[PDB]
Amino acid sequence: MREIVHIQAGQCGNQIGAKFWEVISDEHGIDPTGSYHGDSDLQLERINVYYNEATGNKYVPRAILVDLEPGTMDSVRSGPFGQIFRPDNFVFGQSGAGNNWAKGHYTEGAELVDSVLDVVRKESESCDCLQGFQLTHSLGGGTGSGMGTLLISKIREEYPDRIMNTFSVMPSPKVSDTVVEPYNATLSVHQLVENTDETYCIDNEALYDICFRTLKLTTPTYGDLNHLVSATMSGVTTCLRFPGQLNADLRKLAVNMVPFPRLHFFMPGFAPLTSRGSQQYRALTVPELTQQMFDSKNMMAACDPRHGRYLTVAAIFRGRMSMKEVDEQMLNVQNKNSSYFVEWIPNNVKTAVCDIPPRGLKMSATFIGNSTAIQELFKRISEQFTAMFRRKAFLHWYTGEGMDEMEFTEAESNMNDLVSEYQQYQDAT
Amino acid sequence: NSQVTVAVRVRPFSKREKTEKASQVVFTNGEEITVEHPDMKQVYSFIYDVSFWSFDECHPGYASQTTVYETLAAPLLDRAFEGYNTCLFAYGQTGSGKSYTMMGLNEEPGIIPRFCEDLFAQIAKKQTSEVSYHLEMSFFEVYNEKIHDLLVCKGENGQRKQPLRAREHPVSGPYVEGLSMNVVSSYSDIQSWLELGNKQRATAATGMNDKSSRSHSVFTLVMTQTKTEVVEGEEHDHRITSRINLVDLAGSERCSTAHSSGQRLKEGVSINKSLLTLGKVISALSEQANGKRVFIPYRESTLTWLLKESLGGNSKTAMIATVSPAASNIEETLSTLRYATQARLIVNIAKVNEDMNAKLIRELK
Amino acid sequence: MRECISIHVGQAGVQIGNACWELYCLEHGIQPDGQMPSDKTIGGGDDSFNTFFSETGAGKHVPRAVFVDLEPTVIDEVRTGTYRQLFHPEQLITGKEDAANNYARGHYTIGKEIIDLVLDRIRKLADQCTGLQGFLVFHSFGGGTGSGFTSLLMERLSVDYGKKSKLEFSIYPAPQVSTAVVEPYNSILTTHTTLEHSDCAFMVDNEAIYDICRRNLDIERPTYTNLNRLISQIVSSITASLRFDGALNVDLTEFQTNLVPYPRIHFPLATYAPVISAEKAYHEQLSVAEITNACFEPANQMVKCDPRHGKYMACCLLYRGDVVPKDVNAAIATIKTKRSIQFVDWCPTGFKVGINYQPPTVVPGGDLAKVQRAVCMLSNTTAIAEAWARLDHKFDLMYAKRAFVHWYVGEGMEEGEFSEAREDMAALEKDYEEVGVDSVE
Ligand SMILES: CC(=O)O[C@H]1C(=O)[C@@]2(C)[C@H]([C@H](OC(=O)c3ccccc3)[C@]3(O)C[C@H](OC(=O)[C@H](O)[C@@H](NC(=O)c4ccccc4)c4ccccc4)C(C)=C1C3(C)C)[C@]1(OC(C)=O)CO[C@@H]1C[C@@H]2O
Ligand SMILES: Nc1nc2c(ncn2[C@@H]2O[C@H](COP(=O)(O)OP(=O)(O)OP(=O)(O)O)[C@@H](O)[C@H]2O)c(=O)[nH]1
Ligand SMILES: Nc1nc2c(ncn2[C@@H]2O[C@H](COP(=O)(O)OP(=O)(O)O)[C@@H](O)[C@H]2O)c(=O)[nH]1
Ligand SMILES: Nc1ncnc2c1ncn2[C@@H]1O[C@H](COP(=O)(O)OP(=O)(O)O)[C@@H](O)[C@H]1O
Ligand SMILES: [Mg+2]
């Protein structure tokens, strides 16, 4: 039995995780009381992946909730699916980080991390075979970027041979939500690059463009954006829970997707997405899913892969399909769009198929791509970074909490080197 | 340019091998080391930059200790006295004759003492009281990507070797936080430090030897050269420093022909990864010297990250591999010959040197 | 009596095995519950043929098979499917982690912790036999399990059992279609190891069958439940002569002798000619000649390799059903008359023939039709050297930059093993060339 630990840190992780458990529970037939009210028997065979069991045929998720303010947690408790979580896993203090990566890493988070690890060491040893970890947080803030990367470093030392899968909302290009956004992200990337195995970069502006163009949503709220991320989170690890023809897992994807140990920042997506009216006018087939997957307008990363090359991609399918259609269609992409793929990787595609689709869709598809177009995200942050660090715009709030200027320069170089390493493969001889 | 001088030392037969009559498989033709398996099947050929045939003391081109020194190490000294950085790597399996080449015995000394004493002699010749020199050294190791200091007085308890961490200074480059440094004036005050370190260096008994090396080791000698100009303005401000790095690397060790588990397995994986990254670095540097600019993955290992400024720019790098000629170790010698190589190794079939009893085509002609 | 052990490794093995024992049960009259109601209705007969099924005194018939995945998903379909009451519950699902499409994971790290059980159940199965004829390993190149675990196992069996035929039935990686980035490495690694222990490896690629089902069976979007039924038939023809009556019977050591000239060129192909739908079962005669000529069509090979770019060394033709020998002799001559089919100068005979009287059976729910006669070809050609070269070039392109290597070292593999395995496939590319050079004096 493969098992996964979920860690939710910050206001972005928990507001995402609350839909995630509202998406996985609705799959396996679990209701808000932790009880089973399903129809099919395949919902229970691999329930141990995400949930643990309780006394009266009740199921408690293996979730760990973290924050520095109790506002996030009281929303989960007094909410749709709050009565299922373990109350002893609601870890929180007071007096949040003030969007200071220092406060979440060194000063305040360090007074709370030892209580977090006590839960993690407890849940893991209760598992038969651990497969990896799962963290949902945000860059641009203090807790998610500081407390998250702190837990990453500690877990990695304890469990270095397990996967550390990290979903992270990266900062958007046009409009910010914090002022010290590049300070906190660069210092997070310095930790994620060295310690994680696969991280999925999400950008909110990409999700707004999806809700506007594809879904034709006029007033999208954060409960909808996360209703898209929860889909990707569920598709990646579905082949650990449901059976299929060509199965996969977190480690099989990391091998094919990570050619070199540092290039593990991915551009995700999900199909099929459509409007409530235009559902009667679309034929739901494998090619119609592929054209939507590889479209630049369904990437959550806010970076055009047509300004770069794919090193290697992945395509996870779900439903009753034909395996000739998958292999033929993913081949037609490489031969047609030959210039957006690398020459020294002959087949840049991994494929996986499951036989149990989503609640009300004959089929679905999940997409993971590793492209050099993520170059722009890190290059953008560095220009913001040096433009601030060159005059010490806000540097006195980070040094005041136990940090030096040298630590800021390390995070810049390791970012700028990675920017070049991706650029080294945008070029042919 | 900054090229990489790869060299190979073919150890001669030992007493045990001569008594067991272990047959010879590594031969030379001058500019090529050739491997002919006793089955007389695929014959491998490797062309290096320098070959040291220490096999038989009366063969032409016999590579003595002094020969090896004057061939590889002395140019690094001449480079160091110009204000540039130098690195000497030592690779080989156990029993291949690596310590003989680097350190030496009470007699027939090696690269370490030869370089040290010649360095001090040239320093003495260049001393004037107008030009001054200062020598400061350190010695550390790398174990599972963690740095440990070898010149620290330690007791006996559990998990005592405190790990240090690497940090990047914007100008001076990467370094080790908290690493000690000690000043020297001769070789007799280096020996007692090296003998303190090599007792704390990590070792463990395995199917190859009961005392094998399981951690990379770096001995770094930092020279500072002070000058003064006669304009009555530049009071002891002309400073130029150089770094000589001497790196003992551990062997690959295949986990297939050695059934292992736990700590030894982890050590092997870490060593293997380090060697792979080092190979990538050296090959990319060769390509850079041959013109095509590339990206060097310095950051994928502590060793390369710490040695970044000593393997790039205006610097000199040498890699001494050591291999044994016996047929009892085909897989390791071929593994050490396939590793230390920048050009392409060629393979053929050459059992047809027995055409007709020492061909005797003299008759045909 | 004659007794064979079928081993299925990984996912490509199991999903094929589920199709095979589906068929073996039908030909012999066995229900999924292991029972055989016909024998108690008859009062005699060994139709519960002890080649593939052992029998207990309670009337239940238990198959001689062990299969293992190193992940529990695909076996758990069997422990909860329609064939649960047939198999021995000793099926290995000690697969708490998968091999992540890594050789180094199925050969070392999780390559062990599972193998001692596998050898024990085999040794139990062998101890129940009055004589073995060989093994049948179903696996797939490209994965970590089918590449790594297959190699470790083939090594050990060559020690414990030694001179016993070991016939592999493997999915060869295709040139264009592929479901993984690191297929070229895993194939070259186990090919290096399995070469010195196997005796005959029957190759199949999933890209050729996709076209066969398209052109012949008229299936426009097939899946693996169709590709694996054809593969079930190729095996039945090989193993039919050990179960049913026939005129020219063929044992398992006869493929090893006629199709393997030199010990390193034991990579033959396979195909199955009368693959037709129910509708096209009419409109055609399906004689020995029309079926036998189809086996030499380059478009009906189950491997994507044009034999016209190479020469044939040996070809074993296994006929089934209402077949008369003269029809075979007349047909084999028609092939040697045609000039597009070139044989090596050192093999003027070339052909082997085997004939059986039990026709093929129709798995209900299937796509294949009922016929009176059916044919299975097995050929060794020099054209397959082109396919070895494609893999070696893919290898070199992405090994010159040391890509994906740190995932293998992270499991215990050395950097040098890649070279040691690329040199052995560069010697194989020559041996296929040396053989194809016509002699001179
Ligand atoms: C008749 C019909 O078409 O109903 C669809 C529907 O109209 C559409 C718009 C649904 C609908 O999508 C949305 O309304 C939506 C809103 C904001 C953000 C994202 C989606 C739907 O909500 C989505 C919902 O699909 C699911 O329920 C999946 O199981 C989904 N889980 C949930 O939606 C869910 C969330 C909370 C509680 C219970 C269920 C899922 C996705 C990935 C992996 C597992 C499960 C279904 C069938 C529909 C509605 C309900 C309209 C689609 O949604 C998805 C991701 O599959 C949009 O395209 C699909 C299918 C249809 O186009
Ligand atoms: N013909 C056929 N091939 C299959 C089937 N399932 C998987 N494959 C092939 O298997 C190849 C990938 O290797 P796998 O079989 O998945 O490897 P594995 O034995 O499962 O080992 P793991 O990946 O670690 O689980 C693909 O190229 C597929 O073509 C099947 O049901 N039928
Ligand atoms: N997608 C998504 N992102 C969010 C949501 N709430 C906050 N964020 C992101 O999280 C960031 C705020 O950082 P946060 O971790 O909440 O600050 P903290 O509470 O002090 O740790 C912003 O950049 C937002 O883009 C949400 O509901 N959905
Ligand atoms: N040039 C040489 N001439 C004679 N013997 C040599 C030479 N080089 C090495 N040796 C032999 O090699 C041995 C050293 O092997 P050892 O130090 O155990 O291997 P390693 O250096 O890999 O640890 C010495 O005992 C010495 O006799
Ligand atoms: Mg599998």
Side-chain angles (χ1 to χ4, degrees), chain A residues 19 22-23 26-27 211 215 217 224-225 227-228 230-232 234-235 270 272-276 279 318 358-361:
Chain A
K19 297 294 300 191
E22 194 179 313
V23 150
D26 146 288
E27 217 125 21
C211 281
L215 294 160
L217 262 153
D224 291 348
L225 276 59
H227 187 297
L228 285 155
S230 70
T232 292
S234 300
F270 170 91
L273 301 176
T274 24
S275 334
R276 260 213 197 57
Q279 201 238 327
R318 286 170 60 126
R359 212 21 139 178
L361 274 191

Side-chain angles (χ1 to χ4, degrees), chain A residues 106 190 194 260-262 404 406-407 409-410 413-414 417 420-421 424 429, chain B residues 165-170 173 175 266 280 292-295 297 299-300 305:
Chain A
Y106 287 116
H190 176 59
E194 293 180 353
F260 307 103
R262 292 155 67 75
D404 47 355
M406 188 189 179
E407 182 165 4
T409 300
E410 298 180 354
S413 185
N414 193 13
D417 296 332
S420 183
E421 189 169 4
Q424 177 53 28
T429 64
Chain B
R165 56 172 194 161
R167 296 282 293 285
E168 185 180 346
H169 193 275
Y175 73 92
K266 292 190 176 181
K280 290 190 284 188
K292 202 266 181 178
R293 183 173 178 177
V294 296
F295 175 81
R299 279 173 175 281
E300 291 180 21
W305 184 226

